[PDB]
Design a protein around this ligand. Structure first.
Ligand SMILES: Cc1ncc(C[n+]2csc(CCOP(=O)(O)OP(=O)(O)O)c2C)c(N)n1
Ligand SMILES: Cc1ncc(C[n+]2csc(CCOP(=O)(O)OP(=O)(O)O)c2C)c(N)n1
Ligand SMILES: [Mg+2]
Ligand SMILES: [Mg+2]
Lengths: 562, 544
């Protein structure tokens, strides 16, 4: 009938489909961590640092729904903040639990370790409040379970980080276990009825009038999961459907009505024209960041833009604050086919043609590779692309249906992906051990977070780690300073990283030509996720996707502008 | 004549003896970084991540006097914060410059990369203000030079981090070059004369009356440049002189009146007794109730505080007179140095107690000795240093992984000061994992530290306290000696030592003692092995 507060936390996490917990142990969280071992089906990742753990919790949340990272007071929590901030910016539900000193220790304002030496125990909490949806610092066992519940609810429903400070003295206190028999209620507060009705009615009327509507899926389509509603929207309507870089994967790219990746002026010409000639745009989850949009270059010819958002709706210039798109989309699906009844299906832009056959010795180039990559991918894959040439190139790759893309286009923290790949791999394993996790990471980016490969090995996770060796920071060389020393890096022996971190079941490969690329990626053995692999991909220093070359110039200009 | 604001920054850093700049590039700081190459004597480290860069800036400042790290808006600065916080906590003067979006980008609230997507360009600055002595976010070219000068002065004189945000557009605007011909004032303002004189008088009188006085040197002894003064204090008075763990290195341990390391109940029995039995204590730079506290920004004598009265100047003037006041003192015996290790067979497996005692044999004057949080930080308290040894042990903040970066920053600083100075790191296997990539940057710059890695298969210091077999205290086992070539080292040595004979043979070797190349030494130790001082506090945490 009773359970410790620490175990209560993990039982609640299990109820919200969290089975792996990220972070590192320290002075104020050890008794809490003990409780993981008491909950069947819960495991502790054992991360190699707190920043990487936060990146990993983000990757896990994207795939599983939410995540939890646990750190220790001061030294642990502050190391995580860049990971937390990226989860805030990108709308990823990560619960950050911090083990803190006992309530009396704080009251005595002792000169404890891991403090600023001034007796202020609130400072780190105050720092994190800036990048959290909400926070809690537990002080009272009587309200503790409700507060844990509140934090978990908020993390899941808002898909933003939440900070939960747990004093070490409270984790071993028993609370009634019966509390766990009432689930945390994840349902959304229903919309204002009148506002929602007006929104739905006017969208149906615009649909009835439109001769060339299009659907554009963006980040919040995925992050505030309306992927199922959006797929139904595409099917019931037959409208051409496009995706943004940040939303890529949110809609199935083998659907007959999929039209390609829209990136404003940086789109493939046919895609730009197909989208911008629309007489109605159904925009699901827009997040109009510089890199997502070719520096704010959208040029819709219609004023008829319907923006669906998690917390509001916009129709043309009219804003409907608080009207949540989930309920709007669900209700629209009931009548939308009828509204679309006039519609004569418009051709979608054709897929990029396959690469022409070339001699096997042809040196690898980016444009060739991103086009060729679609041959290797399979349904169910998680495909992760690091900020750098990889993030820009992957926009050119055609995904199989049911591909989960991760590209951190807004926050853009290089090194994120090594951690995200660990998190995505734990989550993928839990869902279906057949699902592959495929990473494209730059040589520069890998250096910032390389040690998290260690944690992949420790758990026998089997991602494909494609490392793009172009001898330094190519994306930056295109922005400014093509030969500047700050854009160069120490040259690593990438293929020795796995054995250096103690891998015992692995493969390494190197590819530098089109023949080598095709032979490796077509090999049946290589296509089974039987073990962790690293593939070093040798590419020219200044070679980059064409869209990045232009993006770089636009970005340099924006920064130098007086 | 005119110079860019960016080049102005690096000219000033040069003038205040900051010659290596840490951090990583990003679009918002690239134009700034170009300016490094325009200033002879300035270099860019090219760090492998920002947290490590901040750790390195901390090591550099400890040895050189102050440091500078440059990061990019949002993603870079937030990565650095645990480093910055440790520097705030331990009073290390690190200037954190962040390249931020242009003034026009901020005004128009452009939804740019590295923002939270909400148009708020103030948030990261506000976060850093919590762990900074002062901040500046530059908005006006006209007052930008004065603000840079203010930030640099404050970093050095307060020995705390300072945050300077530089919009990308402003770094390329021109300022009057003549400004550089007037130095930044980097000196402490003189003390209030009457207050300072009261303090000096009172101290002498307490000295005269004390039967069992001691000197105790703590963190701010070395950080605020009073090592020289303290040394003279020991000589003139001949009082027993002790250091704290954070102060270790700030008193030369070969002095006849040096009595050891005061670590409370974890001190050598004689040491604990000798300090705790004092009737007067001359406490230098702290970080019976008859205590004189010397601090960088104030003095305290028993219950009386003297705000603003700075120790640097009190100590100088005291020395002019101090000899007379202590002649009634009859030199009491200081605790004896720990006996050398007895001879044992060369095959004797290594244990920490033996190792920290033996380590003194290897160390030489001028060495920088860095010890990581974990068994290493406890063990080094047991090692006797040669004269002129600089210790780094982050006892207050205690962030594992700190030392890999600190070692990089210390090695750059030590190179600039004297190429013959060696940098010696003792880091645990666990801690190395958090910051391992910074070895890459050591190799890039041909730096030659000695990297001793304590392989005891996991987090021993935690295992001793809680969960001796808990999975969270275990780590993935790395091949440590492969790290150097994995990071592209060409000129290096690797060694493994598991016995006393192997330890002696290596560390006594003439070629090994020459800092001619980067070296890694993997030290094989038992899982539950630790120094006696840590075993003791394990029993204190026990006995419940
Ligand atoms: C944490 C962090 N620090 C710095 C940056 C700035 N930055 C953007 S791209 C980049 C280099 C990426 O290099 P690489 O991974 O080699 O990709 P490439 O373009 O060469 O494929 C850097 C340092 C960043 N985005 N995040
Ligand atoms: C950034 C950070 N995370 C976690 C901790 C908690 N912590 C203190 S000691 C320690 C273990 C250190 O292990 P190791 O470096 O192997 O030293 P050993 O005691 O084994 O010699 C940990 C995880 C910390 N102090 N700082
Ligand atoms: Mg690269
Ligand atoms: Mg260890």
């Amino acid at each position: 009938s009773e359970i410790t507060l620490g175990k209560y936390l993990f039982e609640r996490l299990k109820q919200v489909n969290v089975n792996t917990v990220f972070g590192l142990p320290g002075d104020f969280n050890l008794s809490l961590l003990d409780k993981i071992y008491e909950v069947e089906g819960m495991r502790w990742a054992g991360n190699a640092n707190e920043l990487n753990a936060a990146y990993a919790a983000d990757g896990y949340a994207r795939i599983k729904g939410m995540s939890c990272i646990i750190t220790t007071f001061g030294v642990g929590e502050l190391s995580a903040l860049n990971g937390i901030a990226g989860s805030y910016a990108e709308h990823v539900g990560v619960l950050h639990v911090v083990g803190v000193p006992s309530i009396s220790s704080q009251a005595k304002q002792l000169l404890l370790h891991h403090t600023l030496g001034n007796g202020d125990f609130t400072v780190f909490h105050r720092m994190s409040a800036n990048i959290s949806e909400t926070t809690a610092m537990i002080t009272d066992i009587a309200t503790a379970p409700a507060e844990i519940d509140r934090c978990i609810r908020t993390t899941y429903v808002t898909q933003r980080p939440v900070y939960l400070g747990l004093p070490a003295n409270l984790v071993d206190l028993n609370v009634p276990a019966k509390l766990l028999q009432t689930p945390i209620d994840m349902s959304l507060k229903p919309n204002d009825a009148e506002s929602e009705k007006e929104v739905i009615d006017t969208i149906l009327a615009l649909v009835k009038d439109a001769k060339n509507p299009v659907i554009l899926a963006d980040a919040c389509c995925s992050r505030h999961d309306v992927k199922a509603e959006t797929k139904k929207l595409i099917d019931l309507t037959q409208f051409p459907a496009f995706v943004t870089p940040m939303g890529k994967g949110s809609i199935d790219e083998q659907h007959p009505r999929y039209g390609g990746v829209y990136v404003g002026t940086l789109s493939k010409p046919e895609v730009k024209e197909a989208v911008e000639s629309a007489d109605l745009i159904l925009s699901v989850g827009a997040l109009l960041s510089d890199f997502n949009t070719g520096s704010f270059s959208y040029s819709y010819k219609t004023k008829n833009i319907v923006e669906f958002h998690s917390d509001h709706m916009k129709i043309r210039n009219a804003t409907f604050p608080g009207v949540q798109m989930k309920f709007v989309l669900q209700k629209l699906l009931t009548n939308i086919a009828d509204a679309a009844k006039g519609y004569k299906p418009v051709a979608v832009p054709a897929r990029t043609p396959a690469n022409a056959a070339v001699p096997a010795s042809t040196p690898l180039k980016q444009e060739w590779m991103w086009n060729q990559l679609g041959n290797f991918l399979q349904e169910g894959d998680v495909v992760i692309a690091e900020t750098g040439t990889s993030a820009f190139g992957i926009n050119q790759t055609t995904f199989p249906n049911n591909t989960y893309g991760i590209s951190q286009v807004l926050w853009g923290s290089i090194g994120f992906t090594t951690g995200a790949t660990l998190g995505a791999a734990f989550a993928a394993e839990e869902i279906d051990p057949k699902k592959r996790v495929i990473l494209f990471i730059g040589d520069g980016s890998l250096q910032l977070t390389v040690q998290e490969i260690s944690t992949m090995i420790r758990w026998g996770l089997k991602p494909y780690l494609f490392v793009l060796n172009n001898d330094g920071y190519t994306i930056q060389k295109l922005i400014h300073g093509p030969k500047a020393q700050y854009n160069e890096i120490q040259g690593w022996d990438h293929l020795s990283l796995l054995p250096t971190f103690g891998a015992k079941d692995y493969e390494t490969h190197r590819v530098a030509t089109t023949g080598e690329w095709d032979k490796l990626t077509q090999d049946k053995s290589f296509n089974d996720n039987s073990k962790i692999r690293m593939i070093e991909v040798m590419l020219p220093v200044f070679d980059a996707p064409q869209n990045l070359v232009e993006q770089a110039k636009l970005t340099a200009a924006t920064n130098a502008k007086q």
